[PDB]
Amino acid sequence: HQDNARKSRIQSEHRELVSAIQSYIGAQDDPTNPSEITLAKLAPYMSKNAKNEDGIVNSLAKDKSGNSSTSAPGSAHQIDTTNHKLISTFTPSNGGQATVLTYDWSANGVNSN
């Protein structure tokens, strides 16, 4: 069920989190290479239904186990700092591979096309 849902339920907010990444990063001490970004951090930068870290993350998709170390409190979003991608990590109730909705801030290639 969540196999199809993961896409949609996360997708809704996934855009939002990256809309917040572009906000977070553009606010950072250095936008060129900001720190690890999380939902709890993206809270102030969210234009989407969110207020503080308790608000945002609870307002966002929540993963089941947290076995992926998503950093986002019980939430299905964890950003990759290596390439600087907005990943949405859904740790399923199956315990299998987590579901991802990705966005590329740095787009190290062909502009993510």
Side-chain angles (χ1 to χ4, degrees):
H1 285 257
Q2 186 72 210
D3 56 279
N4 269 268
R6 56 95 191 180
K7 190 131 203 297
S8 178
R9 62 115 36 112
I10 298 167
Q11 235 185 269
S12 305
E13 316 285 59
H14 153 65
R15 313 198 302 136
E16 318 292 83
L17 282 320
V18 1
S19 189
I21 262 190
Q22 300 187 268
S23 295
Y24 185 166
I25 295 182
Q28 281 258 215
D29 186 80
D30 180 88
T32 96
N33 189 269
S35 303
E36 161 181 276
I37 288 196
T38 59
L39 308 193
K41 294 176 193 298
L42 285 177
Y45 307 110
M46 299 291 308
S47 48
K48 168 268 191 196
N49 187 31
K51 294 292 155 175
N52 301 143
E53 108 184 89
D54 170 80
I56 173 46
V57 180
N58 185 271
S59 281
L60 292 173
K62 310 309 283 306
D63 82 302
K64 186 54 69 76
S65 47
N67 284 149
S68 307
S69 194
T70 191
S71 305
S75 244
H77 293 277
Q78 160 76 150
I79 278 116
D80 182 76
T81 50
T82 305
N83 282 207
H84 272 124
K85 271 178 305 181
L86 180 348
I87 282 77
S88 315
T89 298
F90 197 85
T91 331
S93 313
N94 212 92
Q97 71 179 91
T99 252
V100 175
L101 274 304
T102 315
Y103 151 81
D104 209 325
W105 157 85
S106 189
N108 192 267
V110 191
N111 203 90
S112 56
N113 181 269

